[PDB]
Write a protein that binds this ligand. Sequence first.
Ligand SMILES: CC(C)(COP(=O)([O-])OP(=O)([O-])OC[C@H]1O[C@@H](n2cnc3c(N)ncnc32)[C@H](O)[C@@H]1OP(=O)([O-])[O-])[C@@H](O)C(=O)NCCC(=O)NCCSC(=O)C[C@@](C)(O)CC(=O)[O-]
Ligand SMILES: CC(C)(COP(=O)([O-])OP(=O)([O-])OC[C@H]1O[C@@H](n2cnc3c(N)ncnc32)[C@H](O)[C@@H]1OP(=O)([O-])[O-])[C@@H](O)C(=O)NCCC(=O)NCCSC(=O)C[C@@](C)(O)CC(=O)[O-]
Lengths: 389, 389
Amino acid sequence: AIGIDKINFYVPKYYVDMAKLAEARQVDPNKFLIGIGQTEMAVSPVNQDIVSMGANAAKDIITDEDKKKIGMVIVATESAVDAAKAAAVQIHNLLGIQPFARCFEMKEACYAATPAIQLAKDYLATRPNEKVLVIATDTARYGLNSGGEPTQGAGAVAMVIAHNPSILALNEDAVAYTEDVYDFWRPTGHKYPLVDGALSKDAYIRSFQQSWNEYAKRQGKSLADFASLCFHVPFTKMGKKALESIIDNADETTQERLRSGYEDAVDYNRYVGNIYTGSLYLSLISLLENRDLQAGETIGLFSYGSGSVGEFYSATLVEGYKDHLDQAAHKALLNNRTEVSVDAYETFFKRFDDVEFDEEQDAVHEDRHIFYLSNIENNVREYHRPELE
Amino acid sequence: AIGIDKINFYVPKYYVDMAKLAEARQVDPNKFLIGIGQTEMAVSPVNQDIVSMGANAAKDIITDEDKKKIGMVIVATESAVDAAKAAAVQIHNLLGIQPFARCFEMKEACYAATPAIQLAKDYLATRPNEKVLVIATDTARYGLNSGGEPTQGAGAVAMVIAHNPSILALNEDAVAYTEDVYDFWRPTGHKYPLVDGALSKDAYIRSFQQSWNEYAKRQGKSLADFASLCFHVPFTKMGKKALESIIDNADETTQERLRSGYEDAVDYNRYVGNIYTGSLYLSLISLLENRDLQAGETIGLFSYGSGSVGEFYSATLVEGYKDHLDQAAHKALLNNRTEVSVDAYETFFKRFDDVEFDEEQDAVHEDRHIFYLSNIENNVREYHRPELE
Ligand SMILES: CC(C)(COP(=O)([O-])OP(=O)([O-])OC[C@H]1O[C@@H](n2cnc3c(N)ncnc32)[C@H](O)[C@@H]1OP(=O)([O-])[O-])[C@@H](O)C(=O)NCCC(=O)NCCSC(=O)C[C@@](C)(O)CC(=O)[O-]
Ligand SMILES: CC(C)(COP(=O)([O-])OP(=O)([O-])OC[C@H]1O[C@@H](n2cnc3c(N)ncnc32)[C@H](O)[C@@H]1OP(=O)([O-])[O-])[C@@H](O)C(=O)NCCC(=O)NCCSC(=O)C[C@@](C)(O)CC(=O)[O-]
C-alpha cells in the first residue's frame, strides 16, 4: 500500500482572539465563536512567508534517510511569492533533500494539495524505495474590515507519501468534479480575493454533493461505510452545513458517528482559521489525534477548491498509527503562541502587505530554532535556518 | 504502452520580423538571425490570453469520444491570469470535457509541462480507458528595449496522453535535477521577469549536463543510442550551445545525426520565439514533422525550468506515427500569419500590459473559428467560442 507516512503542520506564533476581533468590528462575539465557528485567528509576522512556513512544517518529519529517498517535492499554494519559480525549489534547498528530484507547484485554490498526494501515490507505484514530500502552504488574507476577514488564517501542512505508510493508506477510489463558477478568485494584481459570499457556500455544497454522489455510485458505498468524514475547512460553520446536507438520508447511528467525527476534525481549525490548501489536511491531523479511530477503519475525504473543483476519496487507518502522530508537539505548537490585540494585528497585517521588515516587532530573536524570512536583497528572499543546522 | 497520442500547437496571428526589430534596436540583423537564431517573433493581440491559446491548441485534437474519457486537464504556465483559479478550469469548460475530472495548474518556470505528462502517464497506469489532456500555455514578455526582448514569443501546445499512444511511448527512465539558482524569476507584482543573462546560460547547460550524466549512469546508455535529442528552446542558439557541450565525447556519426536532428527540432521555434512551458514540446512537434524518424527509434528529451529544475527522459516512436501528425495544418498556421511593424508591435505590447480591448486593432471579426478573449466584466473574463458550436 501507499499513503501518508508522516504528517505535520506549522502556524505562526501569533493569534488574535475572535471575541476581541468581534468587539472591534462592532458585532456580538458569538457571531464569530458560534455563528462562523472560529475561536482564534492566526496572525502572520513578516518573517514568515509561505516558504518558511512550509519548511517549518516539513523539517520535523524528514530524517536524513528520507532526504536521500525523496524523489519529488510538490508545493500546493494560492499565495505564491513568484510567478515563475516554484516555492518547492527553495524548500527543497532549505531541507537539504537529494538533488535528483522534481520540484514544482500545483495550483487550484484550496484544492491543490489533493492532486499532489494522489499523483504522488501514482508516481510511487513503481518505486517502492522512494518517497514524495507534499507541502500545502498559504496565507488567507481578505483585508481589514472585509467580509471574509473573520475567516482569515495562515499556515502549512507537510505530508510524506510512501509505501507501507505508517498512518493512512490511500485507496483507489478517488473521483473529482469540475464546474466553472466564480464564487472566489483572485486576478493577477489583486492583493485580496474577490468573493461572492452566498454563492461560495452554494458552490461548495454542490461540489460536495456531486462528488459524493458519483463516488457512491461508482463504489457502491454509502455513508454508513465510513468511520468518519474529513472535509476542507474555510470555517467550521461551513463544514457543518455541508455535512448536514447529505447525512440528511443516513440512518441515526451513522449521523451520530459522522457528526462526532466532524467535531474532532475541526477542533484544531477553530484555533487557526482558513489556511486554504492546508485546511483539509490540518483537519485530517485534528481528526487523527482527537479521535480514537481504529486501524482498518475508513475515512471519507472531500477536498474543495473555488472555481471550482471538488474530489471525494477514501483512506484507511494503518495498524499502529497513533504511535506515529505528534499530538504533544501539535498541542504545544498551538498553546505556545502569543495573543496580540486587534490594533497590533492590524499593524502586522499592513506590514505584511509590503513585506516591511521589523526584527523587534516580529521578535526574530525568539525564532532561533525555525526557518524564517530574514530579508530581501536584490529581489531575492533570504532565510534564517534553524540554529541546530 | 502509455504516451503522447495526439499533439498540436497554437500561436497568435501576428508576428514581427526579427530583421526589422534589429533595425529598430540599432543592431545588425544577423545578431538576431544568426547570433540568437530567431527569424520571426510571435506577437500577442489582447484577445488572446493563455486560456484562449490553450483552448485553440487543444480543440483540433479532441474528439467527442475524448471528451468523455479525459480524466484530468493540467495546464502548465508561468503566465497565470489568476492567483487562485486554475486556467485548466476554464479550458475544461470551453472544450466541453466531461465533468468528473481533475483540473489544476502546475508551475515551475519553463519546466512544468514535463511533470504534467509524466504524472499523467503514472495516473493512467491503472485506468485503461481514460486519457489526460496537458496544455502548456505562456506569453514570454520581457519588456520593450529589455535584454530578453529578442527572445519573446507566445503560444500553447496541447498533448493528449493515453494508452496505446499513436505517436510516442513514454519510457520509464526519467531523472530530474534541482538546484536553487536565481538565473530567472518573477516576484509577485513584477510584470516582467528579472534575468541574469550570462548566469542563465551556465545554469541551463549545467542542468542539462547533470541530468544527462545521471540518466546515462542509471540507464547504462550513451548518446549513440538516440536517433535525436529534443530540448527546451528559449532561442535556437541556446540549445545549440547546450548540444555542443556534450556531443563533445560522441563519435562522428553520432555528432552528425544529433546536430541534424537538432536543426529539425528547432525549425518551427525559429518562427515563434520562446513560449516557456511549451518550447520543448513545440520543438518535439517540429522534430516529428520535419524529420523522417523511423518507428522504434528513440528520442532523448531535456526539459528545463529556471530556478532551476531539469529533467532528461526518453520516448520511442510508434509504428505509423506519421499518419497522426498535422504538418499541413501547422505549416498553414505559421504561414497564414500577418507581419506587423515594430511600431505596431510596441502598440500591441503596451495594450496587452493593461488588457486594453480594441476589436479593430485585434481584428476580432477574423477570429470567427477560434476561441478568443472577448471582454472582462466585473473581473470575469468572457470568451468567444468557435462559431461552429
Ligand atoms: C462566511 C461569510 C459568508 C460570513 O459572512 P458574515 O456576514 O460575516 O456572517 P453571516 O452574516 O454570513 O452569518 C454568520 C452566522 O452567525 C449567525 N449569527 C449572527 N449573529 C449571531 C449572534 N449574535 N450569535 C450567534 N450567532 C449569530 C448568523 O445567523 C449566521 O449563521 P447561519 O446563517 O450560517 O445559520 C463571509 O465571512 C465570507 O465571505 N467568508 C469568506 C469566504 C468563504 O469562506 N467562503 C465559503 C467557503 S468556499 C471555500 O471553502 C473556498 C475558499 C473560501 O477556501 C476559497 C478557495 O477555495 O481558495
Ligand atoms: C540571450 C541573451 C543573453 C542575449 O543577449 P544579447 O546582448 O541580446 O546578445 P548577446 O550579446 O548575448 O550575443 C548574441 C550573439 O550574437 C552574436 N553576434 C553579435 N553581433 C553579430 C552579428 N552582427 N552577426 C552575427 N552574430 C552576431 C554574438 O557573438 C553572440 O553569439 P555567442 O556569444 O552566443 O557566440 C539575452 O537576450 C537574454 O537575457 N535572454 C533572455 C533569457 C534567456 O533566454 N535565457 C537563456 C536560457 S534560460 C532558459 O531557457 C529559461 C527561460 C529563459 O526560459 C526562463 C524560464 O525557464 O521561464
